[PDB]
Design a protein around this nucleic acid. Structure first.
Lengths: 117, 117
RNA sequence: GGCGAAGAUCCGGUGAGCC
RNA sequence: GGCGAAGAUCCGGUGAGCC
């Protein structure tokens, strides 16, 4: 298939909880273009990438480059569900964490749960 | 009426007739943005401004900003007449000549006819 | 109520085509 | 037939509002 990572529901939902309570403290990028070029700036602390993208063309590129710049990234759920997580009113194929707010020291834990594959 | 130098009709028609036969003879920029950059870059030797343009604004800036950069300019009644004269298929509020093609002597005499009203 | 991060609006550049 | 130098298309920035 498109993205080559598999991930249980519980930690995907951990991604939506972290992304749901990051906005009040840090910064987040919404949408695949802002994610791709915000990370291409080198400013990603954790990337959101989803497989329910149609056509797969939409994001079939960013996990690989997020492995190059060695920025964390996680395959998560439905575009809609993350859309609610980042708190915009529309589906979202890809997101990013740009500033860690007052929470900071969980994002590392999540990156190493990503390193499991 | 932003006509700050009232130009005769016969002189308008001679200017548009001259402007008719200089589009593979010389080079002309079409449209208020291309005319205004023609004056700003500094490569316009004679710009045409139509006076029935509405809103006036759309080209109202170009005679004064044109005079300051000391590029001559001449006034024309209908935007339509100018637009069809400069062989494009739509009305045109403002035009410019940036290269005089082979017509150095006629445009020279006409420029001196402008500087005088 | 419809459209919208599968990118709304706006801006810059480009300059004669697009349906 | 319609739209178009009162800027078609295309490219750029911006990132959440527009009817």
């Amino acid at each position: 298939s498109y993205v080559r990572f598999e991930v249980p529901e519980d930690m995907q939902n951990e991604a939506l909880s972290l992304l749901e309570k990051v906005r009040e403290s840090g910064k987040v990028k919404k949408g695949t273009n802002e994610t791709t070029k915000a990370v291409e700036r080198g400013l990603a602390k954790l990337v959101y990438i989803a497989e329910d993208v149609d056509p797969p063309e939409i994001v079939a590129h960013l996990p690989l480059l997020c492995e190059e710049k060695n920025v964390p990234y996680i395959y998560v759920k439905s575009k809609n569900d993350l859309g609610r997580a980042v708190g915009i009113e529309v589906p979202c194929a890809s997101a990013a964490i740009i500033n860690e707010g007052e929470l900071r020291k969980e994002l590392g834990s999540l990156v190493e749960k990503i390193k499991g594959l």
